[PDB]
């Protein structure tokens, strides 16, 4: 039986990989960061509250300039906010109100959104006519759009409930690369700072490091017991953190190809909706179903702080590129800026 | 007031955006939201035709009331990842085919289609996001049931059935079997209608059930509950 031989070959290959990973683990992150002075108590405070969304907020994304925000709600509305003055810069009506993701381009010229319509819509912010228009509609996925991220004004990466990811050229509307290998729904994406790699986390409790230019999976990481809902790169690009329904955040190192640290508490039994790092990478911020946000010491795995102030599930997080502020958005239809 | 001329103009723009958002929200609050679920394809498309590739939205108006119906067929993904998007829906319309009791899924031969429909109903009705929302159940193709019950006994799908093999008790048994899956009987109601491919009163039934849901929500708001 050829199929049996292939299955046994796969099993022994997996055993060899696990043995190599075990041979590379001569120490843990906890026994090296043992002598580090602890962070202390992190006490951030609400500086702004953003009102105007009339339904559950699902996504937000900071601009590169660290003033401008885009947030997406089930109103069928995208709002671009000035965070310094709380002014609403733009209000964009959506053709489908079932949005789950939004992205703001690094140049500031475009906004992307999508969701249960299976389509990624690219919106032009800077037109001669003075209004926001639909630049492109990207079709080709057969399941819902869970996350999208720009590489430049012409390239964007999306992940879907197809179990696949796709890299698109915006000008032609065509799917340039397809990333396959997941078995469950892909829920989150994060781009490396140099933009040459992906990490994607899926409902099969696995994360996968992808090469953008070749279209092939470089590495696979496991260890969670349930669906991975959130994933984020360490600021230097050599590690990433994942958040899951099993209530644990995990740190994975690309070069060592292992899991370094686990962030969990006995009093935390809810799923994690979102994760993000600070500029130095020392603090790991995660939003929960407990209606709040936790700040972990990423090197000690200790709980350093709490952001409370949302009356419903914290659905989305962001940290600015210069690290001044945090933005949180929840199902109570509010956005909050924290310093 | 320590603002530039352009800052004041920006605030004026933001205020106009606020008024537009409020107007849109007021219009949104006054429409009925219906989530259309069916196991496979039971009568769902025929229901949509009578009342007139991601989520499909259908708009219509009946007796000065505006209805939005969302069809989540052709979304073959994990339901538990997007079902909470319909937490605030006004009602769930669930379509079940009466003639599909002897037939099989044709993907897995052992399981009857009716048992799959009952499993889907049990998952939807007792779902944590839908604790206090009501279900309008449509039992489709009753006439095609009429031709089949008089030859094929219902015991093929429900061995414990001990009634007569005529349509009144068979249909009553199926309705009772579906309603017995409701494990929250003090919070949500189930409205059952026996329809066909050619019926005009389905929209009237949905209107009456939605009127009851609105009255119940108003009772909860006014403090009589």
């Amino acid at each position, epitope marked *: 039986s050829e199929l049996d031989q292939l299955r046994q070959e796969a099993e022994q290959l997996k055993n060899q990989i696990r043995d190599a990973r075990k041979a590379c683990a001569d120490a843990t992150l906890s026994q090296i960061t043992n002598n580090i002075d602890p962070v202390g108590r992190i006490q951030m405070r609400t500086r702004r509250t953003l009102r105007g969304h009339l339904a559950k907020i699902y996504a937000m994304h900071w601009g590169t300039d660290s003033r401008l925000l885009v947030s997406a709600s089930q109103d069928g509305k995208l709002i671009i906010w000035d965070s310094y003055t709380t002014n609403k810069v733009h209000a964009i009506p959506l053709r489908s109100s079932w949005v789950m993701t939004c992205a703001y381009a690094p140049s500031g010229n475009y906004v992307a959104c999508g969701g249960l319509d299976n389509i990624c819509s690219i919106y032009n912010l800077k037109t*001669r006519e003075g209004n926001v228009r639909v630049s492109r509609e990207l079709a080709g996925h057969t399941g819902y759009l869970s996350c999208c991220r720009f590489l430049d004004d012409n390239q964007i990466v999306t992940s879907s409930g197809d179990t696949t990811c796709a890299l698109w050229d915006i000008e032609t509307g065509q799917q340039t690369t397809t990333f396959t290998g997941h078995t469950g729904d892909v829920m989150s994406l994060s781009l490396a700072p140099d933009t040459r790699l992906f990490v994607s986390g899926a409902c099969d409790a696995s994360a996968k490091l992808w090469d953008v230019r070749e279209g092939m999976c470089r590495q696979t990481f496991t260890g969670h017991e349930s669906d991975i809902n959130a994933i984020c790169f360490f600021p230097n690009g050599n590690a990433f953190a994942t958040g899951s329904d099993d209530a644990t955040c995990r740190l994975f190192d690309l070069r060592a190809d292992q899991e370094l640290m686990t962030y969990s508490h006995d009093n935390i039994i809810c799923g994690i909706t979102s994760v993000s790092f600070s500029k130095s990478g020392r603090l790991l911020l995660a939003g929960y179903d407990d209606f709040n946000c936790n700040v972990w010491d990423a090197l000690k795995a200790d709980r350093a702080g709490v952001l409370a102030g949302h009356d419903n599930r914290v659905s989305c997080l962001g940290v600015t590129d210069d690290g001044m502020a945090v933005a949180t958005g929840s199902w109570d239809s509010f956005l909050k800026i924290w310093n | 007031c320590t603002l*530039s*001329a352009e800052d004041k103009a*920006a605030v004026e723009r933001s205020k106009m955006i606020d008024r537009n958002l409020r107007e849109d929200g007021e219009k949104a609050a006054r429409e009925v939201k219906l989530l259309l679920l069916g196991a496979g394809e039971s009568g769902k498309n025929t229901i949509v035709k009578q009342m007139k590739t991601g989520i499909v939205e259908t708009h219509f108006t009946f007796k000065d009331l505006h209805f939005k119906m969302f069809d989540v067929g052709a979304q073959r993904s994990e339901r538990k990842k997007w079902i909470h998007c319909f937490e605030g829906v006004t009602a769930i319309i669930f379509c079940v085919a009466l003639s599909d009791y002897d037939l099989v899924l044709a993907e897995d031969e052992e399981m009857n289609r009716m048992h799959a429909s009952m499993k889907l109903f049990d998952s939807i009705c007792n779902n944590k996001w839908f604790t206090d929302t009501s279900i309008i159940l449509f039992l489709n193709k009753k006439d095609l049931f009429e031709e089949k019950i008089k030859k094929s006994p219902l015991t093929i799908c429900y061995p414990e059935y001990a009634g007569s093999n005529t349509y009144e008790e068979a249909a009553a048994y199926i309705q009772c079997q579906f309603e017995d899956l409701n494990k929250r009987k003090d919070t949500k109601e189930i409205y059952t209608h026996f329809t066909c491919s050619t019926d005009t009163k389905n929209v009237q039934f949905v209107f009456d059930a939605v009127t009851d849901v609105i009255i119940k929500n108003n009772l909860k708001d006014c403090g009589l509950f």
Partner: single-chain antibody
Amino acid sequence: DVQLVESGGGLVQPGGSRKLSCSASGFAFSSFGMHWVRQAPEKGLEWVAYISSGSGTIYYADTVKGRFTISRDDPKNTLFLQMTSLRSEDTAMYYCVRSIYYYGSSPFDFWGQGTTLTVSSGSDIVMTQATSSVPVTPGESVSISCRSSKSLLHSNGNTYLYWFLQRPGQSPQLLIYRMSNLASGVPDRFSGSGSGTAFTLTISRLEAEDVGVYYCMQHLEYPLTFGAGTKLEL
């Protein structure tokens, strides 16, 4: 394409009433605030009236206050100026100007063609362009100056200076919309720099099409005041 076409200008007797109209095509008229700016035969630009998007705020210059009314009809995309008690000073060419305001926007970015009106028979900031004319040769760099009565730098960090180019026989074109911010469709040769009350526009690798009058404007507070105008020759 963006288009503003103006009508209603002609010879008028003193003390009469005339109504100027500005049809709008190719853009969302309701979103943009609208300004009326006039140029006399002396060729110095003067701001006259402003109507905001939604008609919430209306501003008028002191000279025309009480005799001029500005209104907009958004459904028909038309801007109107009603002028009463016309005086000899009023004779000028009137320009409809488009202007939108939000974080990062570019106001005063499109100007109309203009129409001619002919009449028979202390806290304001003053903007000072010292040099009236500069003879230039193509290929050299040219610096134009604009001194201001008070500092134009607000507590935000914005300096509210605008640079315009008016070519012979054309309407003014925006070049620099805030100090050192370059407009769209404008070559990278033009640059702007300054501090406080002192300002400078630098043109590198000058070309023939640059010949015209260069104006400097402040947008710190109303009324909006223009410079005298610096002319480039040869």
